[PDB]
Amino acid sequence: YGHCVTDSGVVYSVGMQWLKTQGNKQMLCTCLGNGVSCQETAVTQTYGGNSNGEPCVLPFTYNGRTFYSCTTEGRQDGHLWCSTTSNYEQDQKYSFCTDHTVLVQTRGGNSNGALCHFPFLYNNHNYTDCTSEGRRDNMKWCGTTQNYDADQKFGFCPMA
Numbered sequence: 001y002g003h004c005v006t007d008s009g010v011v012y013s014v015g016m017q018w019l020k021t022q023g024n025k026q027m028l029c030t031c032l033g034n035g036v037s038c039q040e041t042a043v044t045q046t047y048g049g050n051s052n053g054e055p056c057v058l059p060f061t062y063n064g065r066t067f068y069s070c071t072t073e074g075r076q077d078g079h080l081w082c083s084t085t086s087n088y089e090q091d092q093k094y095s096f097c098t099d100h101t102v103l104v105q106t107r108g109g110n111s112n113g114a115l116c117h118f119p120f121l122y123n124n125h126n127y128t129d130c131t132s133e134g135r136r137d138n139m140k141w142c143g144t145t146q147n148y149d150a151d152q153k154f155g156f157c158p159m160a
C-alpha cells in the first residue's frame with residue numbers, strides 16, 4: 001500500500017526522494033502517491049536574477065566553462081547564481097539559487113538508499129541534521145521524509 005519501487009526492487013514510501021538514472025545521467029526520483037516524481041537533480045529555488053522568478057536551463061556555460069548547476073562564480077553575496085537559458089551567451093538570463101538546496105542520500109536499515117530530506121521532522125521536532133535519536137554509536141541518521149516519526153523511515157548519513 002503506497003510507496004514506490006524503482007531500480008529493480010528499491011521501495012521508497014511516499015514523500016520519499018532518491019537518486020536514480022535515466023540513460024547516461026542520474027535523475028532524482030521521489031515517491032508521491034502513485035507517481036514517482038522523477039526529475040533532474042540540479043537547480044534549486046531560483047529567486048531574482050535575470051530570470052525574474054523563473055527556473056534554470058542547464059547546462060549553462062560562463063566565462064569559458066560549462067556549468068551543469070548553480071555556481072558562485074562572480075557573485076559574492078554568498079548564494080549561488082544559475083543561468084536560465086541553454087545559451088547563456090544568448091539570453092544571458094540567470095537566477096540566484098538558495099544555499100544550493102540540500103539533498104541527503106542515506107542508506108541501510110529501511111531507507112534503502114533514500115534521498116534523506118533535510119530538514120526532517122522528528123516526534124514533532126524540526127530537525128536539520130543526521131540525528132542519532134536512540135543511537136549511542138559512532139554513526140548518525142536522519143529522516144527520509146519531512147515527517148520521520150510520522151513516516152517511520154530513517155537512514156544512515158554519509159561517512160566520507
Ligand SMILES: *[C@@H]1O[C@H](CO)[C@@H](O)[C@H](O)[C@H]1NC(C)=O
Nearest residue numbers: 119120121123124125126127
Ligand atoms: C517544522 O518546520 C516546518 C517549516 O520549516 C513547519 O511548517 C512545521 O510546522 C514544523 N513542525 C513543527 C512540529 O513545529
